[PDB]
Every structure is written in C-alpha cells, then in structure tokens.
Design an enzyme around this catalytic site. Structure first.
Site, PDB file in Angstrom:
ATOM      1  N   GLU B   3       0.993  -0.914   0.070  1.00  0.00           N
ATOM      2  CA  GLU B   3       0.173   0.259  -0.015  1.00  0.00           C
ATOM      3  C   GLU B   3       0.997   1.709   0.171  1.00  0.00           C
ATOM      4  O   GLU B   3       1.116   2.060   0.985  1.00  0.00           O
ATOM      5  CB  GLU B   3      -1.319   0.218   1.269  1.00  0.00           C
ATOM      6  CG  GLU B   3      -2.252  -0.558   1.193  1.00  0.00           C
ATOM      7  CD  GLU B   3      -3.455  -0.460   0.098  1.00  0.00           C
ATOM      8  OE1 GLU B   3      -2.698   0.998  -0.517  1.00  0.00           O
ATOM      9  OE2 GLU B   3      -4.744  -0.061   0.595  1.00  0.00           O
ATOM     10  N   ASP B   4       1.578   1.053  -0.852  1.00  0.00           N
ATOM     11  CA  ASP B   4       2.445   2.853  -1.384  1.00  0.00           C
ATOM     12  C   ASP B   4       3.241   2.564  -0.471  1.00  0.00           C
ATOM     13  O   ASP B   4       3.612   4.052  -0.020  1.00  0.00           O
ATOM     14  CB  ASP B   4       1.817   3.460  -1.432  1.00  0.00           C
ATOM     15  CG  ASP B   4       0.313   3.794  -2.800  1.00  0.00           C
ATOM     16  OD1 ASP B   4      -0.167   2.800  -2.571  1.00  0.00           O
ATOM     17  OD2 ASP B   4       0.458   4.501  -3.829  1.00  0.00           O
ATOM     18  N   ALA B   5       4.552   1.731   0.360  1.00  0.00           N
ATOM     19  CA  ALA B   5       5.286   1.915   1.598  1.00  0.00           C
ATOM     20  C   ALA B   5       6.303   1.169   0.663  1.00  0.00           C
ATOM     21  O   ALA B   5       6.426   0.863  -0.321  1.00  0.00           O
ATOM     22  CB  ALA B   5       5.084   1.258   2.427  1.00  0.00           C
TER      23      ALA B   5
END
Ligand SMILES: [Mg+2]
Ligand SMILES: [Zn+2]
Ligand SMILES: [Zn+2]
Lengths: 65, 283, 258, 94, 48, 54, 76, 152
Positions: B3-5
């Site tokens: 998740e966009d990490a």
RNA sequence: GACCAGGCG
C-alpha cells in the site's frame, strides 16, 4: 557540497578520484574509457562521479564568523 | 512495503543518503513603553515574578545572550528579558524571556545584534538541527509516486544481483498497473544505460531518445533488453524463481517529516471564555 | 571433498571457487565477512575552532568515513568481546587550500589513513580548523563505517548450445569477446559462467529447448575486495575463526543447561 | 548467547536464543535437518524491530535421542567443516 | 560587562558594552549589524 | 440470554464496584487490572447482578 | 445573534463538538506482524498519556514497583 | 479497508478512555473482531487485500510444489501449531520429497468445513459442469475422482 | 482572540 568519500550502495572509496576524472574528461577523452581506467566497474559507483555538482566553491563567499 | 510503502537500506542511510538539516530563527526586541518604562536584556534574578528554574538559564552570557554552538533542548532560554511590572505586584519585574519551542531540539548557529528603525535593540538567533531518515518520512519521485518509509533493513538481509548490485530502494509492483506510469520504467532503463555509458540521456518531451534505441544500447552493453536480472535471496541464500526488474531512478525527499507532526496532550491551558482545551500543536 | 582454488588475485581483490559445501555455509560466510569482522574507525571528534563553510557534524561524518589501517598481531580480532584501545588523531590547518586526508598526525604509527588524497574541506583566506579525533574498534553490524569490504557470490553454471542453431558462431564469438572460457565439442558448445552471460534478443526463441543452463551442485564463485584496511586472506581467516568461536560458545552454553 | 527455555515436554523443545540473528540460526537449522532422527525443526523472527536478536526455535525428535544431544551433535559438526575450510584456504592462498 | 563583537561586513573586532551604548555602529564601517563571536571552548561532537 | 448491551453494562458496573473496595468472589492471578477480574468473574458465571426487563 | 449560528456558533461549534484532553496524532506505517486487534504506539506517547488505576490487594506489588521507576523510565 | 486508509502520508487520532465503565464499554462493544461483517450489505469488509490474493494464487495454482525446508519454514512463520509433517505427495529426482500447495493450505481450514463454488478464473464452463454433475450424483465423491478432474 | 493567504488526507 563536496564529493562524497564512499559510494552509498557498496561503500567503495571514490572520493579521491573525482578531480582526475573531471580533468581527463575536460581534456577530450572518452568518458567510458576514463571510468574503466579508474577501476569503477559496477555502475553504482559510476553513478556517483557522473552526476555530482561542486557547490562548495560558490558558498564560501558568505562568512558568518 | 504494501500500500504505497517503501523499504530503504540502512547502510545507505549510514553513508549519507538523504541527509538534511533544519533551520529556524527566533526574534526578540527591547521595546520602549509609555514614559520611562522599558525592557532590558539581563539574566533574571530569582526574585522576579515568573522566574523559571535556574537550570534553564544555563548557557546565557552575562549580557543576556546565548553563546553560539551550544546545545539546547526544549524550553531552554535563548534571550533573557525582564519586562516592567504589571499594574494590579509592585517593584516586581516580569520575566518574558524568549525560549525554544517545547518540542524542538538543535544547536545554536549564529547570533546577530542590531538596531531597529526607531532606536530599539533587536537580536535574532538561529537553531540548527540534524535530521536522519526514519519511519514515516515521505519520499516521492517526479512521476507522481509517493509514499513513506515502512522498514529499515540491514545490508546483509537485502538481496543482491548476480553482477554485484544491491538495491537502494524497494517498491511494490502492485502500484504500477493502476497508475499507468510507464515513464518511470522508461526513466529507470534510461538511467541505467546513462550510468553505464558515462553520458547523460536526453528526455526532452517529444524529442527525447526513443525507447527502442535505449533497449538496443542496453543489449549491446551486455545486459538484457528487458531490464531484468537474477538476484539471490538475502536470508536463505538461493536465487529467486523470477528475474527482477532493476534500474536507477531519481527520487526526492519532501519536507513533510514525522518529527513535525507527532503530538500528545494530557492536561494543559484552556480557553478563557469556554474553559475548553486550546487549539493548535504550537500551544 | 572440500577444496578451494583461485582464479584471480589482483592487488585488492581476489576471486576464488569454493567447492563442496551447502548453500547455508556460503551465505553464513558472506554474512560473517560483511558484519562481524572488526576494524578501526573514528567515533568522536572534539573541536577547538572551526571556521570552514561546513558544519561540525558534516566534517565529523566525513572524518568517520575515512578508512584506517588495522594491525593484526597486536589485538585479538576474532574474540567475541573487543578491546577498547583508543587512538587519537590531530590536525591543524590554516589559509587557502584543500585540507587533504594526509595531514593527520596519529599517536600510534600502526593506525594511519590508508589513502592520503581524500579531500576533507576547502578553506579560504584567514580561516582555521583545529580538532582532535578518537578511533576505536567496532563491528559492521552496528554501523556501516566499520565494514572491511564487500562480498558476493553466484552459482557455478555451464550453458549448453546446440550446433543445430544455424548461427551459433555469433554466440561463440560473443562469448569469446566477453572473456568467458569456451570449450567446443561435437554438436555442442559449452560456456563456463565465470561472469554473467545474458542471451541476446534474437536467440530468445531457442532458449529453454536448445539453449539450457546446467547447474553444478555445491559450487560457488566468491568475490572479495577491500579498501586497504586489511588483507583479504586475513579477512577470510578471521571470519572462519569467528564462526568456530561462535560454535564453541554455543556448545558450552548448551552443555551447562543440563 | 543465552538460552532461554520456553516449553519442555516429551520429545519437544522450544527456546529463545538471545544475542543472535539469521546468520547462525539458519546454519544451525540447516545442519540439524540432515539428522535422520529429527522429525520437525524450524526457526523464525517474531518481529524485525523489537526482537531482531531473539530467534525462536522448535525442535521435535523421534525419541531415539533427546533434543539436547541432537543440538550438541549438530553444533559439533560446524566446528569440523569450518576448520577444514580454514585449512584448505590457508593452504591454497600461498 | 564588556564583551567582544565583530562587524557584519568588515570582520574587524568592535569592543563596546550593550547596557549603556545608545547606538550600535562599527567605528570602522557605517554598518549597524554586529555578530557575537564563538567562545573558545572544546565542543565535543559525536561522529555518527 | 443477555443482550450485549446488558452484558457490557453489567461488566462495567462490576468493574467499577471492584475498584472501590468490594471483595472479589474468585481467586485471581496477581497484577490483574480490575476490568480483567470483572471479565473473569463474568465468564465464570458467578456475577450476582441481575437486570429487570419490562 | 452571530454567536448562536453558523459553523462556529455556540451550537455547532462547542455544544455538539468540543476539544478533548487525552489524545494523540501522528503518521501511520504498515505492520503485518501484529494481530488485527492490536496497534503500535510510540514509547514517547505511551509515557505521556496516563490511565488512572485504583490500588487493590491483587495489584499492590506492581503499582509499588511502577511508582519507584519515576516519570522517566518506561514503566512508571 | 474499513478505515479506507493508505500509507502515503495519512494520519490518525488516538483516544484513551479513563473510567472503568468506558473501558468496559470499549472492550465489549467496540472490538475489531466484532465488526468483520458490514451492516450495509451483510458481507465481509475486513479481509485480504493486494498481495494477500496474489500470494494465495501463487500458492494454490496448478503445478506448484515445495521442498521440505520451505514447508517447515512457512508453517513456523505463519504460527501454525504443528509437530509432524504430512505424507509427501511426489518425489523429485534423487528422491527429494515434495508437497503441493493445496496440502499446505488445507492445514488452516477447520476440520468439518465443506463448500463449493466458481471463481473469477472460469474460462471454459464445459469443464466445471462435469465436476458439478459428479458432486450432484453422489453427494460425497471419491477424492481420487475429484483430483483427476481438478480445474482452477 | 479574530481575520487573510498557502498546503496535507
Ligand atoms: Mg491517502
Ligand atoms: Zn558502489
Ligand atoms: Zn566594520
């Protein structure tokens, strides 16, 4: 500001061979041959010298005492 | 890194990657009041009202100004000032010194003394603080991909390509198809090719070097035209089942750091009118 | 059985083939070399007056990044608890010019910078820089400044090329140009993967059925290089000694449990 | 390196290993898996941040031998081949 | 209470007391901006 | 038979009662916060409070 | 009239919603190694927010141990 | 999903109840595991997301097989209480035992579960019809017959 | 304390 001492990714010391590369590339040599001569094989180290700016020389004019 | 990490190497951070410094300036004035009343730069006496603990007036010179290059913590006093007494308390000066913000930390950098446009004294003090990347810091490329650091990994745990390259950053493949940013892959291939060739690559809009030329050049240089490589798992020690895309991508560090967003309150000052807690991180 | 042979022994890099061990042992050796081998490095700097264009922390980090020599005989470099011997380095520079790394005076002659050409800072007219630095033994796992070098390995594979491919001569010429050893037999060309060998685009159709890779079991090609802090053979021997010491301590601790 | 026993019953042993990481744990479990009298053995790191130096081990044996002697035998094997590798390297380097 | 100060643009030392001085000016330059020089104390900094 | 609202109210009332001086009706391991003691009492089925329903 | 109407009036501004005392705010980061009903809390926040507790006969020892640590060690 | 959160700069608030009644109410009424089913449409809201589906497909696809060390390591990592590996499914060269992905996945399900349906990967519907017919004719088919007619 | 301007999800 000034040339980093060691390559970030692998830690190889490249801080002492920037001026020679700059001079030999300003003398009209082939940059790839110069980099090969200097001994930098992995491109993680060539990235360090190929994309550096010497910003130290234009900030010493301002002194804070 | 879901998740966009993003995941960042530790040894890269220890060698100076994405290191930055933060500045801040404080201002104090020796104002003049109606009549002979005036302020003064002075180390406050224990008698005066509002006198803080004597620990805070630790590194103030006898003229009332802090020595440069001295460490300061939160609530430490930079400039000592004593206001005239407040009419109802008589013969009691008020302590109105300028202090560091309660949730900051740094080192004094410079001190300037000057005079304002009407004769009053004026001093300006700057504080220098060093900030190293940690969890929560925001990193973002120029193709519209943003995220925060999820985990910091030791070097020996990261995988390495069979040609001797260790990744400096890990990005989740789930984020590519939805956003349809093919320019990031193009830039990665072009950057790797440019670093290998010792010359920068032009990418000026509709006139830049075409993709097929870059792929053919990469094939000529010895690597694979698809941009994939073979890596070995950093823990088990054996190669993965799939070739892995890898390249060089320009990245930027935004100024939305986590050190300026943490906040917690238990009890504190309240509004005068409604006797409810105040508003703002600063107060 | 277990055996080792050397392929290249240049000045500060050695490439050798390790044969007859499991993958876990090779990965453990690599991790041990990367993390456990100790080395001298700067740890604290005391400044008296610094008037350069860089803050104190930047100069301290730049000093910490400079490699230093490490004597082998004097100290126990394989013990699990390191000594705390401290070496002091001093400097005093003034006036215009570049302050090179070769202007550091050390108390102990065995601890000096390896390369006296690394720039530290640029000074203008009338500026000064005086400080003292302290160095101490450390380990790589705590900070990256203590790492001795860089190690990686790969499998030892042989690539088979059938001669039924109409243009195998181009592949043979490319393999020769790259520098990989080539052995030619009947209806087959064998290439040894000392260095990575990626098939070009035109021959990707035949890959898998007529061009296939053969993996020799229990064989790896290591590669160790150093910045001049320690010789490579010393690094390898120290890592192996550290592994043996860890095993012995685990044996003792397990034996005292019952 | 301290050994902290968590659960000990029948032929099952489960313990922490304080002051260690993947480097020794993976080698130990890989050495253990060669024993024909070990039915199940594995290790894991519960949390990479708070417990990066406390691997958890589980050893289950047939019952012909106790887990402790299997662990001792496995730990003795590393000390042998490590020394052999050192001897070979020191012979070959010169 | 006498302290040392340095001119903003000339760098030459100026010696005056802030308590009673009514105007701040380098006797050498028209500037009214002054620095406070660093003390002579061995500051200690970590190398991390 | 209890609705979850009634269960929560009963547990809260007993937890409040315990923290003021009321003795515990069952043995409890030391260091247990009063709310956990009330929860243990409830799942053991020894809670004396009852609810009146129209 | 203006004090009683609008999005900042006495009705929708203070009576319906008001600022509270025990709260904290910070960024979030993923962590898949904890169970779904747990949350990670920084040690800085955990040492600021406090939970009142009444000393009884089954928790006197732990409370007495905690008080000795003072306000600067973590359990305190 | 229920928070609709994403790790790109988001922030969240945290509140601490103070009275025992509030703590009991939060503990009994507001637990996370009590809100798996969404009240809007009576379906699960908390579940897998992104990699939790791709990894499952990689594990349970046709032809997936694992060695002993991978199986032991994954089972230990997941937290499953196991003290004996099941029977191997097939032997590689040199007689290395191998376990299939379905066998590994079956260790998490309860013992008495039974269900069947069709997922999104249905391309040819003429092959699921045979399985449905086999299930319909005999309510508990022989596992060998089902394994012979498997389909993704 | 109230206004104005600019940012973050
Ligand atoms: Mg968001
Ligand atoms: Zn490098
Ligand atoms: Zn002047």
């Amino acid at each position: 500001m000034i040339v980093p001492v060691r390559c970030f990714t692998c830690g190889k010391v490249i801080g002492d061979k920037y001026y020679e590369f700059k001079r030999r590339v300003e003398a009209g040599e082939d940059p790839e041959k110069v980099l090969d001569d200097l001994g930098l094989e992995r491109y993680c180290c060539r990235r360090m010298l190929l994309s550096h700016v010497e910003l130290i020389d234009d900030i010493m004019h301002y002194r804070v005492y | 890194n879901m998740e966009d990490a993003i995941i960042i190497n530790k040894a890269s951070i220890e060698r100076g990657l994405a290191r930055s410094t933060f500045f801040r300036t404080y201002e104090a004035e020796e104002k003049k009041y109606l009549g002979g009343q005036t302020d003064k730069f002075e180390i406050p006496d224990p008698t005066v009202r509002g006198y803080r603990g004597e620990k805070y007036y630790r590194n103030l010179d006898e003229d009332g100004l802090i020595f440069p290059e001295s460490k300061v913590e939160g609530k430490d006093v930079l400039v000592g000032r004593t206001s005239p007494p407040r009419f109802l308390s008589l013969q009691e000066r008020r302590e109105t010194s300028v202090a560091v913000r309660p949730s900051e930390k740094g080192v004094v950098d410079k001190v300037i003394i000057t005079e304002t446009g009407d004769g009053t004294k004026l001093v300006k003090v700057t504080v220098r603080d060093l900030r190293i990347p940690e969890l929560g810091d925001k990193f973002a490329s120029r193709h519209g991909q943003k995220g925060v650091i999820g985990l910091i990994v030791p070097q020996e745990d990261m995988p390495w390509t069979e040609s001797g390259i260790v990744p400096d950053l890990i990005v989740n493949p789930h984020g590519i198809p939805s956003r349809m940013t093919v320019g990031q892959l193009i830039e990665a291939i072009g950057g790797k090719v440019a670093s290998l060739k010792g010359r920068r690559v032009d990418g000026t809009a509709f006139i830049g070097e075409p993709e097929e030329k870059l792929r053919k050049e990469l094939e000529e240089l010895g690597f694979k035209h698809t941009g994939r490589e073979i890596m070995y798992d950093g823990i088990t020690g054996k190669r993965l089942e799939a070739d892995i895309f890898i390249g060089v991508i320009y990245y930027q560090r935004l100024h939305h750091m986590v050190a300026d967003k943490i906040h917690a309150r238990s009890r504190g000052p309240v509004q005068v009118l409604t006797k409810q807690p105040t508003e703002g991180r600063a107060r | 059985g277990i055996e080792v042979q050397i392929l290249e022994k240049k000045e500060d890099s050695i490439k050798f083939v390790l044969k007859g061990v499991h993958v876990s042992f090779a990965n453990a050796l690599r991790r041990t070399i990367l993390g456990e081998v100790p080395t001298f490095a700067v740890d604290e700097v005391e400044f008296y007056e610094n008037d350069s264009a860089l803050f104190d922390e930047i100069i301290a980090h730049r000093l910490a990044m400079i490699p230093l020599t490490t004597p082998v005989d004097r100290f126990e470099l394989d013990a699990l608890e390191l000594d705390d011997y401290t070496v002091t380095l001093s400097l005093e520079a003034e006036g215009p010019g570049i302050v090179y790394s070769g202007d550091l005076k050390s108390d102990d002659p065995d601890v000096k910078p390896v390369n006296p050409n690394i720039p530290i800072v640029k000074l203008a007219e009338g500026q000064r820089l005086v400080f003292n630095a302290y160095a101490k033994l450390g380990r790589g796992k705590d900070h990256a400044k203590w790492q001795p070098g860089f190690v990686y390995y790969k499998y030892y594979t042989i690539v088979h090329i059938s001669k039924s491919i109409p243009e195998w001569k181009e592949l043979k010429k490319l393999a020769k140009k790259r520098g990989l050893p080539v052995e030619e037999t009947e209806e087959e060309v064998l290439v040894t993967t000392i260095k990575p060998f990626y098939i070009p685009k035109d021959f990707e159709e035949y890959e898998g059925k007529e061009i296939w890779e053969e993996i020799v079991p229990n064989t790896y090609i290591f590669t160790v290089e150093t910045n001049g802090e320690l010789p490579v053979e010393e690094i390898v021997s120290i890592a192996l000694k550290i592994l043996m010491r860890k095993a012995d301590r685990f044996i003792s601790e397990l034996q005292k449990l019952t | 390196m301290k050994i902290e026993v968590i659960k000990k019953e029948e032929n099952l042993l489960e313990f922490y290993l304080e002051g260690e990481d993947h480097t020794f744990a993976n080698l130990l479990v890989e050495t253990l898996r060669e024993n024909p009298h070990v039915k199940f053995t594995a290790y894991t790191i519960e949390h990479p941040i708070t417990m990066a130096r406390k691997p958890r081990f589980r050893v289950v044996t047939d019952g012909e031998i106790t887990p402790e002697e299997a662990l001792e035998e496995a730990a003795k094997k590393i000390f042998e081949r490590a020394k052999e590798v050192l001897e070979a390297w020191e012979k070959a380097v010169k | 209470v006498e302290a040392v100060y340095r001119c903003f643009k000339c760098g030459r030392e100026v010696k005056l007391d802030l308590s009673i001085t009514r105007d701040l000016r380098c006797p050498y330059c028209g500037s009214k901006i002054l620095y406070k020089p660093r003390p002579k104390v061995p500051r200690r900094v970590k190398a991390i | 038979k209890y609705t979850r609202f009634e269960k929560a109210r009963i547990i809260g009332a007993r937890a409040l009662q315990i923290s003021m001086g009321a003795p515990v009706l069952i043995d409890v391991p030391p260091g247990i916060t009063p709310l956990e003691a009330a929860i243990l009492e409830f799942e053991k089925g020894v809670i004396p409070i009852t609810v009146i329903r129209p | 009239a203006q004090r009683l109407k609008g999005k900042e009036g006495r009705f929708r501004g203070n009576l319906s919603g008001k600022r509270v005392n025990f709260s904290a705010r910070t960024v979030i980061s993923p962590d898949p190694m904890i169970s779904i009903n747990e949350v990670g809390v920084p040690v800085e926040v955990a040492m600021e927010l406090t939970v009142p507790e009444k000393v009884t006969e089954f928790n006197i020892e732990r409370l007495r141990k905690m008080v000795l640590n003072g306000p600067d060690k973590y359990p305190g | 999903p229920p928070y609709n959160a994403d790790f790109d700069g988001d922030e969240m608030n945290l509140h601490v109840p103070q009275t025992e009644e509030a703590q009991a109410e939060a503990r009994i009424l507001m637990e996370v595991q009590n809100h798996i089913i969404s009240p809007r449409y009576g379906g699960p809201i908390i579940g897998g997301i992104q990699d939790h589906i791709s990894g499952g497909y990689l594990l349970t696809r046709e032809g997936a097989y694992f060695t002993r060390d991978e199986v032991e390591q994954m089972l230990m990592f997941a937290g499953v209480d196991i003290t004996e590996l099941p029977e191997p499914d097939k032997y590689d060269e040199n007689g290395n035992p191998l376990w299939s992905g379905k066998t590994i996945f079956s260790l998490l399900l309860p013992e008495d579960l039974t269900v069947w349906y069709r997922n999104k990967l249905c391309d040819e519907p003429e092959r699921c019809e045979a399985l449905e017919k086999l299930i319909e004719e005999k309510l508990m088919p022989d596992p060998e017959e089902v394994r012979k007619l498997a389909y993704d």
